[PDB]
Amino acid sequence: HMGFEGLADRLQQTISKIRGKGKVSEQDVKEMMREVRLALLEADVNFKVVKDFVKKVSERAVGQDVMKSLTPGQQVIKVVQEELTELMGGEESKIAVAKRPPTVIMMVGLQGAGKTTTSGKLANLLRKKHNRKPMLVAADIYRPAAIKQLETLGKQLDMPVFSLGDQVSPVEIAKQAIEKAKEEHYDYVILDTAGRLHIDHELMDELTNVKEIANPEEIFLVVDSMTGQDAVNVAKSFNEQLGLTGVVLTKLDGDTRGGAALSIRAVTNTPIKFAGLGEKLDALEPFHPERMASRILGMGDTLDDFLEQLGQVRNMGPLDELLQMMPGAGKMKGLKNIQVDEKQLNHVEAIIKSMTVLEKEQPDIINASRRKRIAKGSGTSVQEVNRLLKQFDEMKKMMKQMT
RNA sequence: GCCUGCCUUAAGUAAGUGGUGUUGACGUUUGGGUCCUGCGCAAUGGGAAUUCAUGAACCAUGUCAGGUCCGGAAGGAAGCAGCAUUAAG
Ligand SMILES: Nc1nc2c(ncn2[C@@H]2O[C@H](COP(=O)(O)OP(=O)(O)O)[C@@H](OP(=O)(O)OP(=O)(O)O)[C@H]2O)c(=O)[nH]1
């Protein structure tokens, strides 16, 4: 949904020049790449990653006109898209599933990254998308309000939150937590671990002790996307002093650059598994490097009863499959239209639910005063009613043309 | 010119056949209608005033899905299928 908006803005005007011109020249690719290189540098992408990326794209883009003279510029875009995709990890990296339940997932990171919130988001995702039965664990004893924060999120999910207070070691908390999860048949155990503002020795000593007693199948670093290269460095230090298997990037809804997301793989070899997209518990999505690459480049992929079904499936029934979300991402690339219904759509739905069942079955049976009364009940005098009838006639004509 | 025809014109006179009344307004006239035609009517039939179940988008029906507005809040609010829902079938 969210992220990278600033890099896109920059790239997409240089992309404009090449896409329109089918012809590929030595000077054209050089020029596009100079702009691409400046945009990646200003987005705080790792410096070595930039210089390697500009090299591999430019090499492929001048054998590509030799590759193909058909749709040549649209070929240059496909190379950039393919390299952006590899740069953010090849393909979706799915959650591990232990051979024997429970799967123990360790959440680590620095204070303020979003550990505690993301723990709750991941539990939520495991139950809704995968039909799992998770358990949250309170292993950060070093701040007050930390436990109560997790417990509060747990009460909104109806999921247990294991805690022994703040006078007991996190090694013991993790141990008992995992054994209760075995006895009571919980699929997943999510450990919310400690952390101050900066790494120290007595953070890593504790985290290695917890890994030891817990033998986790996944160790996720939760890291703030808006910190750019500082996030890449936090990743490097965690991956070296214990083992990371994954990364959760938080606060993409405030990250217009994307430096961290374009750099984590190449510097640490750790894959990005999820993105946080907001404060609520349901703002977590799997990281899909194709679709972000496509995003960055502006590249995509009974009349009354039918109206009621369209209103149900369009207003609150959003959620397509078979790459429907991928081709419809960003309003299907905007579609050259800057107007959304919103309250206009709400008024259209209110005008739609202004007629009887017979009027819904036969829309042409309404007399002039017959839907003058309906317009008085709806709020638009004749304008909304006649626009709705014109739209229904246009939809009928389109259905007759399609059939 | 009835010598034959005035038989159709002022009674009949009589053999043949089923009956029948006139002094009696009699009675052995047994069995049928005894107003057929207009006035005020009552067996009897045809459609009834009124009885029990169901029924108006606006358009008469109390809040009688909701959305807009007045309002940080609430109520008025297609009272749309359901409710009393009538006379209208
Ligand atoms: N917009 C957005 N926010 C996220 C996201 N993930 C986490 N946060 C926010 O970051 C802040 C830290 O979250 P925690 O859950 O406490 O992280 P921690 O355990 O690592 O300390 C929280 O709010 P906070 O403490 O109130 O933030 P602030 O007031 O310090 O700025 C949280 O709402 C995300 O994906 N999008």
UniProtKB/Swiss-Prot annotation:
GTP binds at residues 109-116, 192-196, 250-253. Belongs to the GTP-binding SRP family. SRP54 subfamily. Keywords: Cytoplasm, GTP-binding, Hydrolase, Nucleotide-binding, Ribonucleoprotein, RNA-binding, Signal recognition particle. Its main location: cytoplasm. The lineage of its organism: Bacteria, Bacillati, Bacillota, Bacilli, Bacillales. It is found in: Cytoplasm. GO terms for molecular function: 7S RNA binding; ATP hydrolysis activity; GTP binding; GTPase activity. It catalyses: GTP + H2O = GDP + phosphate + H(+). This is Signal recognition particle protein. The keyword Flavoprotein does not apply. Composed of three domains: the N-terminal N domain, which is responsible for interactions with the ribosome, the central G domain, which binds GTP, and the C-terminal M domain, which binds the RNA and the signal sequence of the RNC. SUPFAM superfamilies: P-loop containing nucleoside triphosphate hydrolases, Signal peptide-binding domain.
